[PDB]
Amino acid sequence: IIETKMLMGEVMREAAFSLAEAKFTAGDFSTTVIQNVNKAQVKIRAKKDNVAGVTLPVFEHYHEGTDSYELTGLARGGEQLAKLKRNYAKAVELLVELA
Amino acid sequence: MSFFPELYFNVDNGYLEGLVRGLKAGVLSQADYLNLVQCETLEDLKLHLQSTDYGNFLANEASPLTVSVIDDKLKEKMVVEFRHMRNHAYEPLASFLDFITYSYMIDNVILLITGTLHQRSIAELVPKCHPLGSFEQMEAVNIAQTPAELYNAILVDTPLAAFFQDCISEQDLDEMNIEIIRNTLYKAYLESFYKFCTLLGGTTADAMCPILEFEADRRAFIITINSFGTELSKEDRAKLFPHCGRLYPEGLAQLARADDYEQVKNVADYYPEYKLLFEGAGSNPGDKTLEDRFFEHEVKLNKLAFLNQFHFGVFYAFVKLKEQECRNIVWIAECIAQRHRAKIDNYIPIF
Amino acid sequence: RGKLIAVIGDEDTVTGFLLGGIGELNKNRHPNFLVVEKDTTINEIEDTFRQFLNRDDIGIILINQYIAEMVRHALDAHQRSIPAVLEIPSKEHPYDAAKDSILRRAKGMF
C-alpha cells in the first residue's frame, strides 16, 4: 500500500496537469458537467477473501455500459477531454485497488 | 459606401477608432513574453506584470495567489473595458456590439436552461453567468420550475427570440439535448450575422467575410471530427453544418458521409492553405495539434484585419485577440503552479 | 453495480472525477458530492460528512489534504472499516506522507 500510494501521488500530479491543459484549450466548461450529472457508469462491489481463517473485504470495479458526457463540447473540441476521461478511469482503477 | 467610404464612417466613429487602437497599443510583445517566462513564482509574475498596463491592479487584493483571482480579474478588466467602449456607440456599431453580447448570451441561455429540468432557482445560477452576457433584464427570475413560462421569458426579453421563433419548439426543448440545440442556435446566429454584414457592404464586408467564412469552416471540421466517436446519425451531422462555408455548394455532404479520418483528410486536402494546416498537424506525442493550428490561423487573420482601418472589423478583432491574451496569461500562471517546464513555449505568440 | 464513489473536494478534482464517470442522484435527489470553495462553512461540511457516513451506498470517500486537516478530529474519531477513507493531493497542497489516519493506525512502521 505504501508503494501504491507513492505511485498514486505522481499519477495525480500529471493527471491534474493534463486537466489544466484541457481547461486551457476548452475554456470554462466545469459548470456544465457539474449541472449535467444524471447517472454513473463506474460502480463497485464487495467480495470476500479469507486467508488463514480470517476474512477481509475486497473491492472490484464494474464498467456499466453507459455515458452522459460522451459528446460534451462537440463543436469546439473534445479530444483532450477524452484523454482526461481515460486518465481518470485508470486513476479510478488504481484508487479502488488501493482502497 | 459603394466604393466611397470615409464619407460617414470617420465622421461618426473617429473617436471610437482611436480608443480601439489605443487599447490595441497596450497589447503585449514578445519581449514581455521573454520577461514573464522567467518568473518561477506568482509573486514574480505580478511583479513583472507591474511593468505592463496591468500594473498596480494586482496589488491591494488577494493575499494568497491562485489561478482563479487572475482569471476573473482579467475577465473583469475585459468586461469593464468593453462596456466603456460600447456604451458611447452609434447605431451601426450598436448592431455589432449587440452581436458581441449575443455571441455569449447564447452560452448564458445554455446555462439558464436545464434549471427547470433539475428544479433550480435563478439567483444561484446568476453568479455563474458570463459577465458580457449579463443582460441586466427583469422577469428573468421566479421561473417556478416551469418550462412554458421559460419559453415566454426568453421570448419576451431576449432578441434571440428571433431564432427561437422558428428553430426551436417546446418539444425540442424538453426532448432534444442541449448540445445540438446550442449548435443550431450558433449556426443560425452566425448566418444572421453574415446576412447583416452583407447588408452593410463596402470595405467592412471585405474585412469581415474571411473571418466568418473560416469560422464556419472550422466549426464544420470540428463537428465532423468529433462526430466519429458518438452514435449520432449522419443526417444530424448534415443539419449541424452551417450554410455559409465554402464547402456548402459541395463537399460538406462529402464530409458528412465520410466516416473515416483519412477520408476527412482527403476532402480537406482540396484547398491549399487547408492542406498546409492539416499536413502541419502531425498529431503525434511531441508536436502541437489541429486546434492549435486553427488558433494561429484565427490570430493571423485578425492581424490582417487590424492592418485595415476604415472598417468595424477593428471593433471585433482586438476582442478575440485580447481573449487569447488573457488565456495566455492564465496559461503562464498555470505553468508556474505546476512547475512543468517542457511546455512553457507552448503559447501563441500574438505580438 | 450499485455502489458509487463519493468525492468532496475543490472544483478541479470533482470536475475530473465526474468526468471519470462517478455521480448519481438518488430517488430523493441528493448528490453524492459537495463542492468546496472559500465561502464553505465548517458546520455544513462536517454535517454533510456525517450524512455521507450514515449513507449505505458509498463505500469509498476521497478527501484532499486541507479539507481532511480542517475536519481531522472527525476522521480520527472514525474507527470503522467498510466506509473506507483515502487521501488525495491538491494543486497548492503537495501531498506529505506524515499526515494520514491509516498511518496512525500503524504508527511507527515507517
Side-chain angles (χ1 to χ4, degrees):
Chain A
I1 188 73
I2 286 297
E3 181 53 281
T4 311
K5 185 166 172 64
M6 294 298 102
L7 270 294
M8 162 295 298
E10 189 277 342
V11 64
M12 294 298 102
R13 186 191 148 285
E14 72 261 13
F17 180 77
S18 65
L19 187 153
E21 291 283 324
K23 274 192 168 182
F24 170 78
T25 187
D28 189 358
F29 62 89
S30 47
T31 314
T32 308
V33 288
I34 288 171
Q35 295 295 316
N36 296 115
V37 64
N38 51 8
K39 176 148 63 60
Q41 70 98 16
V42 300
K43 288 132 175 184
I44 64 183
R45 297 293 289 169
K47 270 61 62 165
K48 332 309 204 174
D49 179 79
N50 197 301
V51 63
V54 294
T55 311
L56 56 84
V58 184
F59 278 37
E60 184 174 61
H61 183 191
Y62 292 174
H63 303 61
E64 191 67 73
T66 182
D67 206 5
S68 56
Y69 306 147
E70 72 295 8
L71 74 164
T72 316
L74 61 83
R76 190 230 53 73
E79 61 270 1
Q80 292 85 26
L81 275 78
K83 296 172 73 179
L84 298 203
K85 284 181 175 177
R86 73 207 59 157
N87 281 56
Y88 276 60
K90 94 187 179 289
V92 163
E93 291 282 343
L94 187 147
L95 270 294
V96 169
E97 189 276 332
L98 61 83
Chain B
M1 74 294 292
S2 175
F3 304 113
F4 263 61
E6 80 257 13
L7 277 298
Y8 306 97
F9 166 82
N10 58 6
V11 183
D12 277 30
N13 318 306
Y15 182 76
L16 283 294
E17 199 278 336
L19 275 295
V20 76
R21 80 209 294 207
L23 274 296
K24 189 258 175 185
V27 68
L28 290 164
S29 78
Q30 294 315 124
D32 292 334
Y33 274 110
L34 292 167
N35 177 252
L36 58 90
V37 293
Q38 49 94 22
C39 291
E40 290 67 64
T41 198
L42 305 179
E43 281 79 26
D44 292 330
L45 183 63
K46 59 163 170 46
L47 284 164
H48 281 282
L49 292 169
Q50 172 57 59
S51 69
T52 185
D53 55 3
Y54 303 89
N56 296 115
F57 298 102
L58 294 174
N60 72 82
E61 70 194 0
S63 163
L65 305 184
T66 180
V67 183
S68 71
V69 289
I70 57 167
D71 189 358
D72 62 354
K73 178 180 186 63
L74 297 158
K75 201 84 185 278
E76 191 275 337
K77 182 170 182 175
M78 191 75 108
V79 62
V80 298
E81 189 276 331
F82 212 6
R83 179 57 32 67
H84 182 253
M85 181 74 85
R86 182 182 65 198
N87 200 23
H88 314 102
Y90 300 176
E91 74 268 16
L93 179 49
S95 68
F96 263 50
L97 302 177
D98 290 331
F99 298 153
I100 305 304
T101 322
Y102 290 130
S103 88
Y104 304 147
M105 195 65 194
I106 194 167
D107 281 24
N108 176 222
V109 62
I110 290 167
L111 294 174
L112 294 174
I113 191 60
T114 79
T116 293
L117 303 186
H118 297 342
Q119 282 74 15
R120 210 64 44 76
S121 178
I122 297 91
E124 293 83 4
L125 301 172
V126 175
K128 300 289 94 176
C129 295
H130 197 304
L132 294 174
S134 307
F135 188 68
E136 61 86 20
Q137 189 62 258
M138 295 298 102
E139 67 85 29
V141 291
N142 64 7
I143 65 180
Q145 292 79 48
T146 311
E149 60 82 35
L150 282 180
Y151 210 96
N152 188 359
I154 76 164
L155 280 179
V156 299
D157 56 6
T158 298
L160 306 168
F163 308 93
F164 301 133
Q165 205 284 328
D166 56 356
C167 286
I168 302 295
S169 88
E170 289 205 2
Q171 187 273 334
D172 298 337
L173 186 64
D174 48 24
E175 270 88 10
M176 295 298 102
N177 56 13
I178 62 170
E179 68 274 15
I180 65 182
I181 294 166
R182 58 91 178 194
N183 189 359
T184 54
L185 277 296
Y186 200 57
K187 159 186 77 172
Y189 178 76
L190 291 172
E191 290 289 4
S192 170
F193 190 81
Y194 175 28
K195 63 151 290 304
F196 177 85
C197 281
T198 56
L199 190 146
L200 298 176
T203 317
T204 57
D206 189 358
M208 290 315 78
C209 185
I211 295 90
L212 312 175
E213 178 34 60
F214 176 79
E215 184 65 25
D217 271 346
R218 173 178 78 81
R219 195 147 302 288
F221 271 29
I222 287 166
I223 61 172
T224 311
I225 180 55
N226 288 3
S227 50
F228 279 8
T230 181
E231 72 274 348
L232 194 83
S233 72
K234 305 302 199 74
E235 55 84 16
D236 299 314
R237 307 183 188 192
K239 294 297 295 310
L240 286 181
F241 300 96
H243 298 241
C244 183
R246 283 276 85 80
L247 280 294
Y248 163 98
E250 188 170 9
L252 271 194
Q254 190 78 243
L255 288 156
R257 292 174 288 168
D259 214 329
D260 307 330
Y261 180 75
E262 167 54 22
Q263 293 172 356
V264 177
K265 177 75 165 79
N266 287 334
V267 171
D269 281 326
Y270 277 50
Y271 189 100
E273 60 85 14
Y274 284 146
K275 302 167 206 148
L276 188 151
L277 190 138
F278 266 58
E279 62 86 20
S283 312
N284 58 17
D287 65 355
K288 60 200 76 63
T289 183
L290 286 76
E291 59 85 18
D292 300 323
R293 263 89 190 187
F294 286 155
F295 267 47
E296 281 100 10
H297 176 100
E298 298 144 21
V299 303
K300 73 184 187 185
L301 194 54
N302 292 123
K303 281 197 291 291
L304 171 153
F306 72 90
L307 183 63
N308 192 1
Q309 49 91 18
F310 286 162
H311 61 102
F312 309 109
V314 189
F315 284 7
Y316 181 76
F318 66 98
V319 178
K320 308 317 301 320
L321 294 172
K322 183 71 174 65
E323 198 187 4
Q324 283 312 306
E325 183 180 358
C326 292
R327 51 169 54 86
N328 289 341
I329 278 174
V330 173
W331 168 288
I332 301 299
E334 190 277 331
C335 292
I336 297 299
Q338 306 299 68
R339 297 144 298 290
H340 185 298
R341 312 307 316 283
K343 286 176 168 181
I344 305 299
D345 64 349
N346 181 8
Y347 63 94
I348 185 152
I350 314 171
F351 294 106
Chain C
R1 184 220 48 64
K3 318 298 284 205
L4 58 91
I5 313 296
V7 298
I8 313 297
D10 63 355
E11 290 56 10
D12 295 11
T13 62
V14 301
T15 298
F17 272 63
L18 269 296
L19 175 76
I22 68 173
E24 269 285 356
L25 274 297
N26 70 342
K27 277 73 69 177
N28 302 320
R29 299 160 76 84
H30 287 87
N32 71 299
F33 69 87
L34 183 63
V35 285
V36 69
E37 69 275 16
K38 83 194 310 306
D39 72 4
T40 297
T41 61
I42 301 172
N43 45 7
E44 294 293 328
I45 190 167
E46 60 197 305
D47 188 3
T48 51
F49 185 43
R50 169 181 299 99
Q51 290 298 109
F52 274 22
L53 183 63
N54 296 117
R55 283 180 67 238
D56 67 349
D57 294 325
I58 297 89
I60 304 302
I61 55 165
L62 307 186
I63 300 294
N64 59 22
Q65 200 69 358
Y66 60 96
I67 299 297
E69 190 277 331
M70 182 266 262
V71 71
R72 184 98 70 93
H73 66 86
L75 294 174
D76 292 346
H78 186 269
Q79 297 296 299
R80 308 293 178 285
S81 47
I82 290 303
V85 63
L86 277 298
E87 205 66 39
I88 59 175
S90 189
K91 309 276 291 197
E92 68 272 14
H93 296 91
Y95 183 78
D96 52 8
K99 262 74 60 181
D100 201 343
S101 303
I102 59 173
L103 162 54
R104 266 52 147 189
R105 180 54 43 66
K107 187 265 183 182
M109 295 298 102
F110 163 65

